[PDB]
Design a protein around this ligand. Structure first.
Ligand SMILES: [Zn+2]
Ligand SMILES: [Zn+2]
Lengths: 522, 128, 50, 539
DNA sequence: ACTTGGCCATGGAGTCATTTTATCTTGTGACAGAAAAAGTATTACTAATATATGTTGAAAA
DNA sequence: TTTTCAACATATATTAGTAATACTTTTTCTGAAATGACTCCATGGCCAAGT
């Protein structure tokens, strides 16, 4: 760092020979410093919570015999995790859980999220929730790729047997390796294929162990085990090469996961098919769900569970919904025509029976869409490549999910080629994203294609214009079957007599609480 | 009472009454309004509420219950401490004529400082 | 600092230090407990010494 | 650091820190530095001084010391030991810097005698007179009138003639005038123990009270010898009128100035609790009795003798009657229309005396209109504190302090009840009051060997303290302020010599107005303090 | 004048407490309970999926 | 009897609407030796009233 006060050289060396330890320059030999002085020998909400999190954290740590080391990395994630206030209103367990799991993933170690969970009451789902949730907030993609080669180890130790397993290990992995190139590996809990290959080489090592004692370490289902085993039974050179001497064939042949094979059982160019559309509507006037529940064919009013009435219609196969505030959700819409059209038909009951019920605030919140490319897909490299926008979560669900920024829409990915699209309010943005990421699909392949026009069908506002937008136009689009969709007065009475009859326990605590309101005075 | 506030509200009320009880009413308009030597014989008049206040407390115009004669005195003592009024001959009382502060040569009010810039002032701290 | 390992230097104890007093050497102390160990220049102030 | 709150000059110097400026500011250099040593280290001897000051022996000490004596800023006592030789020793003259510290107020003494000629040359005359009499020392009408022009009317040019007596003005000061009052008590302590007709060793009581009574009764005329002596006042030479003795040097009396200025503070206290008419009445009511009462004069021997938990009562009850009976004859009995502007019949208008009730006057000999004092004056002073903690901490403070007044050693649980306010205020306006002392603390160990939390706390007053460190007011701006006068001077120091021989530049005229308003603040500010000072230090 | 009692001050005396007791080595080593804020989890929707889990059971061997 | 299928159901992350309720976290807010002293006692002496 410093410079010689004479030679003006920057090269300094501390001579350790004679027990001076002087610092000198190799240039003029002047010393910088002789006499080498050396050393020897509150109130916060954050200190409480944090150090408490090193307590609770370190607790679950050596339970799993993970490195104590990694705890410090995870903890500081928890630190950063608190910075966004993501950690506030959830179950402390699920928080620190993912907080540790994300760490031990970043190190590529063997602990499987299933194993991590069973310390608790928990469903390996709530954890699966929280983990995948903090994937969004704290921005992380590339790191956590789980792989078989690790799980077999921690398995292998608990598998008893003898020193032979090491050979078996060396045996099994090369097995599992080809199965990955055998292109059956994706879309599977890695533990499953783990215990699978273990059972395989074990049988190949002529040692007899049950299916149960395997999943004792594996934590998968017996049937889940033998299924993919059978999926191996039909493979190329499956029973053909199944003899001894550890088949050295690395040549894969074809790649055919039992995915589009199911489509073979059922049987750019292809445009993604629309599926469902959901919107919202506002009447502008609040109503009585009790009174609205009186005359309808489609109604469910059960305040004990959920406060609302459930409505739907046979045609045009739509559902929608209602609120108490005088608003409603629009569901069951396979297109925009049937959306606002039937949406007004829902106001025909009220404006026929209940209050003013105008038609206001009609906006699609989301549109569902799906498509299929009819060819196999490699997910492991996809997220390994596009991971910035591409989150393939580990075995916490079959499909890969993709978060597109431009425009912002979520797409789901099945190796079958089935590709789902939702999170969009616009039909054009759908096919924009589809023809945009189609070169990513075709981009990742091993060894239709004509987009035609980027926009073919009429726009969304064309179909919205195909329906009367005026809140006062009702009887024009009234089916007159809604005159039939009203039940008679006796159906109301006796039907409401049954409903109230079984709901008077809800009304019991209801109005009893209303009396407690008077008791509040004292 | 209730432990918390809205007391001094009625305090200034009783101080109005007893303030009247001394000489005739305030008469602070011009220089000499006081007492004109207390009517006749600025001796003979020995005046207070004690019992009498609760008859004046009858006025209400405020949401509350009644109040006990013992608690009356407990109020008046505070004003003795604040010197809003004086204690003469047991439950009798006077006023300290600090209706004048209502409004060297010495009193707190009727005085204001410069208290900006110039470095020559008098504090009560910075000896400490 | 102390002993072997770290680095050199040795002990003059009050049990020993007295020895040179008997011989009467002033200059050996001033070399010894002054120059050779911690030689230091302090700047003081005559007025109100500190 | 930052020097603006000035810490170096700001604490380790109480008491004396006043004087060492006064004599410095008002005299300077060597003349000052002695008194600083004197007050600090107490009793001291001529040669012994220079053991410390480094003041060039028997030069300054001689010059400066006698210089002070002419201004009577020092007390002077010499005697010889029994071994031989002789020696002197010195003290600082009582207050005495009291004189300097007041000054222009002692000039304002004119206002009492301001009558006859009102705001005349006579005003300016007597002004020049007294302001010179303080400046020099003791004066003689012979030598001063000699310095004054001859060949004009001497009893007129110098028209303050019979007026030389009044209450204040002058008394011949000699010898026993200024000696430590203590040590003169110890000297008068001779003749009584030292003189006994070798009677018996038995019963020191006969040796004591007798000697003490003899000590006491002889002491009386000792202070009354200066009080008034006719051979001064009575002289009426030929072709002339009744004059003092023009020969002897006489000096300003401090106590009748003390007395008179005290009367003003009572005029202020009453100027509250009664009416302006009744007030003004009382204002001229003292003017007849303002002569006699001791105020600070009687306690006297209270300094300079060990009290006795028995005999000190014989001192206090002596004070209870002292002014009441015989000096009561000098006091208000029947007095009529002193000046006044109520009008027409003035008699029942005089009967207003009974209107005075609390907490002063309002007693008499049974039915003659009279005000007691020897009881009143003592039972009065104990009240006078009052305010002086209103703007200070805020008014909400008083009532609780004032509450701690009546009842005593009272826990805050029942303070919260007795006084009235939430906790949030009481905690502050108490704690804010306790750092400034006053209230102090009591406690008791509660199931403790000696512990904090488990114990319970009490309060008190103990007014001696609370009064006392209000003499921080002494060191407060009667020191810091006066210095803020001094350090100012050096800015215009180069100008001061100019303005001296002037009676130029616009900015010079600007800072003239500046330093002038500055001054007019600093001294009027002082008088504001001093008016608040007169209470505590004495009475 | 002449003896006693009480009384207060002082001198001993048997009471309890603070700091030493050697060098040169030479490795070694914060309270809880509660309040309130804030925030999220549900509980209805379709709804395209592909695993998983099971159970059961039915049908085949 | 077993094994196959298989089927049958059922969560399962996506997306918003809700609105409502409930439920947890967070962030404040206070119930051996040898002198030192220390007290504890005993006498001297002094002051007094009865003698
Ligand atoms: Zn160099
Ligand atoms: Zn210095």
């Amino acid at each position: 760092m410093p410079v010689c006060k004479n030679c003006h050289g920057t090269e300094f060396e501390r001579d350790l020979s004679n027990a001076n330890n002087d610092l000198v320059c190799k240039a003029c030999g002047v010393v910088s410093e002789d006499n080498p002085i050396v050393s020897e020998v509150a109130l916060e909400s954050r200190e409480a919570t944090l150090n408490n999190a090193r307590r609770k954290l370190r607790a679950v740590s050596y339970a799993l015999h993970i490195p104590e080391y990694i705890t410090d990395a995870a903890f500081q994630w928890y630190k950063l995790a608190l910075a966004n206030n993501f950690v506030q209103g959830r179950r402390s367990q699920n928080v620190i859980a993912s907080c540790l799991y994300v760490a031990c993933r970043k190190e590529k170690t063997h602990h499987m999220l299933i194993d991590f969970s069973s310390r608790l009451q928990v469903s390996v789902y709530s954890i699966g929730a929280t983990f995948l949730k903090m994937v969004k907030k704290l921005h992380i993609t590339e790191l956590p790729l789980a792989d078989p080669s690790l799980f077999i180890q921690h398995f292998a130790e608990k598998l008893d047997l003898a020193d032979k397993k090491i050979k078996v290990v060396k045996d099994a992995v090369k097995l599992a390796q080809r199965m990955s190139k055998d292109w059956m590996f994706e879309g599977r809990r890695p533990a499953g294929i783990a215990g699978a290959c273990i059972l395989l080489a074990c049988r190949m090592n002529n040692l007899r162990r049950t299916h149960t004692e395997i999943v004792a370490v594996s934590h998968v289902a017996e049937e889940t085990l033998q299924q993919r085993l059978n999926e191996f039974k039909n493979t190329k050179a499956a029973k053909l090469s199944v003899q001894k001497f550890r088949e050295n064939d690395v040549e894969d042949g074809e790649a055919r996961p039992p995915s589009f094979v199911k489509n073979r059982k059922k049987e750019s160019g292809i445009v993604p098919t629309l599926q469902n559309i959901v919107a919202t509507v506002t009447l502008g006037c609040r109503l009585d769900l009790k009174t609205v529940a009186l005359h309808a064919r489609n109604a469910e009013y059960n305040p004990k569970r959920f406060a609302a009435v459930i409505m739907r219609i046979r045609e045009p196969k739509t559902t929608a919904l209602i609120f108490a505030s005088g608003k409603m959700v629009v569901t069951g819409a396979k297109s925009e025509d049937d959306s606002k059209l039937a949406s007004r038909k829902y106001a025909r009951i009220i404006q026929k029976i209940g209050f003013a019920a105008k038609f206001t605030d009609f906006k699609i919140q989301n549109i569902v869409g799906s498509c299929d490319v009819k060819f196999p897909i490699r997910l492991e490299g996809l997220a390994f490549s596009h991971g910035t926008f591409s989150s393939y979560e580990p075995e916490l669900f079959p499909g890969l999910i993709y978060r597109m920024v431009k425009p912002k829409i979520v797409l789901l990915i099945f190796v079958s080629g089935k590709i789902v699209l939702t999170g969009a309010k616009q039909r054009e943005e759908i096919y924009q994203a589809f023809e945009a990421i189609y070169p990513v699909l075709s981009e990742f392949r091993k060894m239709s294609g004509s987009p035609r026009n980027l926009h073919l069908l009429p726009t969304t506002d064309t179909y919205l214009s195909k329906v009367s937008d005026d809140p006062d136009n009702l009887e024009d689009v009234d089916d007159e079957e809604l005159n039939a969709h009203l039940l008679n007065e006796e159906a109301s009475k006796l039907k409401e007599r049954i409903w109230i009859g079984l709901n008077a326990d809800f009304l019991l605590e209801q109005e009893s609480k209303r009396l407690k309101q008077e008791a509040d005075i004292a | 009472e209730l432990d918390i506030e809205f007391i001094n509200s009625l305090l200034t009320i009783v101080w109005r009454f007893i303030s009247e009880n001394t000489f005739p009413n305030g008469f602070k308009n011009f220089e000499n309004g006081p007492k004109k030597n207390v009517f006749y014989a600025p001796n003979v008049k020995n005046y207070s509420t004690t019992q009498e206040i609760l008859e004046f407390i009858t006025a209400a115009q405020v949401a509350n219950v009644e109040l006990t004669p013992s608690n009356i005195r407990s109020l008046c003592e505070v004003l003795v401490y604040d010197d809003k009024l004086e204690k003469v001959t047991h439950d009798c009382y006077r006023v300290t004529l600090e209706s004048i502060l209502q409004m060297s040569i010495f009193n707190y009010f009727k005085m204001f400082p410069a208290s900006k810039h110039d470095k020559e002032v008098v504090y009560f701290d910075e000896w400490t | 600092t102390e002993g072997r390992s770290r680095d050199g230097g040795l002990r003059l104890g009050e049990m020993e230090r007295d020895c040179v007093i008997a011989y009467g050497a002033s200059q050996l102390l001033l070399e010894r407990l002054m120059i050779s160990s911690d030689a230091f220049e302090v700047d003081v102030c005559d007025k109100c010494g500190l | 650091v930052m020097t603006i709150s000035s810490l170096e000059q700001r604490t380790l110097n109480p008491d004396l820190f006043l004087y060492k400026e006064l004599v410095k500011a008002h005299l300077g250099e060597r003349a000052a530095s002695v008194i600083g040593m004197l007050v600090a280290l107490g009793r001291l001897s001529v040669r012994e001084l220079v053991e410390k000051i480094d003041g060039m022996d028997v030069d300054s000490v001689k010059t400066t010391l006698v210089s002070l004596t002419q201004l009577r800023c020092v007390k002077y006592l010499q005697e010889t030991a029994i071994s031989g030789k002789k020696t002197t020793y010195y003290y600082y003259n009582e207050e005495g810097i009291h004189i300097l510290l007041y000054s222009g107020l002692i000039i304002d003494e004119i206002i009492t005698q301001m009558r006859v000629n009102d705001e005349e040359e006579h005003k300016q005359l007597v002004a020049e007179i007294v302001q010179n009499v303080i400046s020099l020392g003791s004066l003689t009408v012979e030598d001063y009138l000699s310095s004054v022009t001859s060949d004009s009317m001497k009893y007129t040019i110098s028209s303050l003639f019979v007026q030389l007596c009044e209450m204040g003005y002058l008394i011949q000061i000699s010898k026993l005038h200024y000696t430590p009052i203590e040590d003169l008590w110890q000297f008068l302590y001779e003749k009584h123990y030292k003189n006994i007709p070798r009677n018996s060793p038995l019963s020191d009581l006969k040796k004591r009270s007798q000697a003490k009574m003899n000590a006491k009764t002889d002491f009386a005329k000792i202070i009354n010898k200066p009080n008034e002596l006719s051979q001064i006042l009575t002289v009426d030479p030929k072709t002339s009128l009744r004059i003092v003795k023009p020969t002897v040097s006489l000096t300003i009396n401090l106590d009748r100035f003390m007395k008179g200025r005290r009367s003003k503070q009572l005029i202020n206290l009453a100027k509250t609790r009664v009416g302006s008419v009744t007030a003004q009445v009382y204002k001229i009511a003292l003017r007849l009795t303002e002569q006699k009462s001791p105020k600070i004069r009687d306690p006297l021997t209270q300094t300079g003798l060990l009290q006795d938990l028995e005999e000190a009562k014989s001192f206090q009850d002596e004070a209870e009657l002292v002014e009441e009976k015989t000096p009561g004859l000098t006091f208000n009995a029947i007095d009529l229309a002193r000046h006044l502007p109520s009008a027409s019949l003035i008699n029942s208008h005089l009967k207003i005396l009974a209107s005075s009730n609390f907490p002063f006057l309002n007693e008499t000999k049974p039915g003659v209109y009279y005000v007691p004092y020897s009881k009143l004056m003592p039972v009065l002073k104990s009240s006078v504190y009052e305010y002086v903690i209103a703007s200070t901490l805020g008014p909400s403070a008083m009532r609780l302090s004032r509450c701690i007044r009546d009842n005593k050693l009272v826990s805050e649980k029942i303070i919260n009840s007795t006084a009235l306010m939430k906790e949030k205020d009481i905690r502050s306006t108490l704690a804010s009051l306790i750092r400034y002392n006053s209230v102090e603390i009591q406690e008791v160990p509660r199931t403790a060997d000696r512990s904090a939390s488990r114990a319970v706390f009490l309060f008190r007053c103990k007014e001696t303290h609370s009064y006392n460190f209000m003499r921080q007011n002494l060191e407060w701006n009667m020191a810091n302020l006066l210095f803020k006068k001094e350090k100012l001077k050096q800015e215009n120091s180069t100008l001061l010599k100019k303005a001296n021989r002037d009676d130029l530049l616009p900015s010079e005229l600007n800072q003239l107005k500046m330093v002038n308003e500055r001054e007019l603040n600093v001294f009027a500010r002082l008088s504001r303090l001093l008016s608040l000072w007169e209470v505590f230090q004495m009475a």
